[PDB]
């Protein structure tokens, strides 16, 4: 009963990004018997501590844990310090625990898909980096990245291949394909097509099979 009750984690602290991560984080380790108890606090705090910021995410979440996590720490508190330290590839903190892996996947899946396509441009909005045609002709020029549409084939399109969770990869594979199709429509529209999608960008930015013949 301390499986649903402890939801009163940030549900009494002081954000929704976590609500979802847990949701898909559970689906990743469904019926594997790993530790769906630590992984939780892992994905529930990885942000409470803002390339130096993840190593402190645990040197921060550990001290703060000694407040409400007072009831049940045990050995399950050193694992909540690797997960919440190995999720953002800003610190390159390689995840070793099979629990610290499920999070580095659930949170990293928040970079792809519909929400992912929204983050790239929202962020790119404040930072004001643009994303216009200044990026299409990059078939012959070079990627300056954060031109948001470039951030696409620099991090995002390369995220699924470096996915370290069995299912999480095939999942970060579909969502990563949703981004390409967006690129497909963006190319056309960008080439005054207004209708179809550039069936040439789908051919280069996403592994066929995810939609296909066999020779």
Query: Judged by CB under 8 A, which stretch of 82-90, 137-145, 175-183, 201-209 contacts a second copy?
Result: 175-183
> In 26-151, which ranges are E strands?
none
Contact call for residue 194 and a second copy (CB under 8 A)? yes
CA distance 32 to 51: 33
Question: Do the Cβ atoms of 95 and 104 come closer than 8 Å?
Answer: yes
Least CB distance from residue 143 to a second copy, whole Å? 17
- Binding a second copy (rule: CB under 8 A), the pick from 118, 144, 204, 208 is 118
122 binds a second copy (CB under 8 A): yes
Q: Answer with the entry of a second copy, Ni ion, none that 69 interacts with (C-beta below 5 to 8 A by kind).
A: none
For the chain, what is the largest distance between any 2 Cα atoms, rounded to a whole number of angstroms?
Answer: 62
d(CA 120, CA 176): 13
**Residues of span 15-44 touching a second copy by CB under 8 A:** 16-17, 19-20, 23-24, 27
Name which position in 73, 125, 143, 209 contacts a second copy (CB under 8 A).
125
| Given 171, 176, 180, 202, the residue binding a second copy (CB under 8 A) | 171
Own/partner pairs, 166-172, CB within 8 angstroms, 24+ separation: 166/28, 167/27, 167/28, 168/28, 168/102, 168/105, 168/106, 168/108, 168/109, 169/105, 171/24, 171/28, 171/109, 172/105, 172/108, 172/109, 172/112
The residues binding a second copy (CB under 8 A) are: 16-17, 19-20, 23-24, 27, 109, 113-115, 117-118, 121-128, 131-134, 148-149, 171, 174-175, 178, 182, 185-186, 188-190, 192, 194-195
């Amino acid at each position: 009963q301390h499986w649903q009750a402890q939801f009163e984690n940030w549900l009494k602290n002081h954000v929704c990004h976590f609500r979802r991560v847990w949701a898909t984080a559970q689906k990743l380790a469904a019926d594997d018997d790993v530790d769906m108890l630590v992984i939780l606090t892992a994905c529930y705090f990885h942000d409470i501590v803002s390339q130096r910021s993840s190593i402190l995410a645990a040197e921060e979440t550990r001290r703060l844990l000694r407040e409400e996590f007072e009831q049940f720490p045990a050995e399950k508190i050193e694992a909540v310090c690797h997960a919440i330290a190995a999720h953002s590839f800003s610190a390159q903190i390689a995840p070793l625990t099979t629990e610290a892996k499920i999070v580095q996947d659930a949170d990293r899946l928040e970079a792809l898909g519909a929400i992912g396509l929204a983050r790239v441009f929202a962020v790119s909005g404040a930072l004001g980096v643009a994303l216009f045609d200044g990026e299409d002709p990059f078939a012959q020029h070079r990627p300056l990245d954060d031109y948001a549409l470039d951030h696409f084939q620099t991090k995002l399109l390369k995220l699924p291949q470096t996915m370290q969770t069995a299912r999480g990869k095939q999942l970060a594979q579909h969502n990563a394909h949703f981004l390409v199709e967006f690129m497909a429509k963006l190319s056309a529209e960008l080439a005054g097509e207004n209708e179809g999608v550039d069936h040439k960008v789908i051919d280069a930015f996403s592994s066929a099979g995810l939609e296909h013949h066999h020779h």
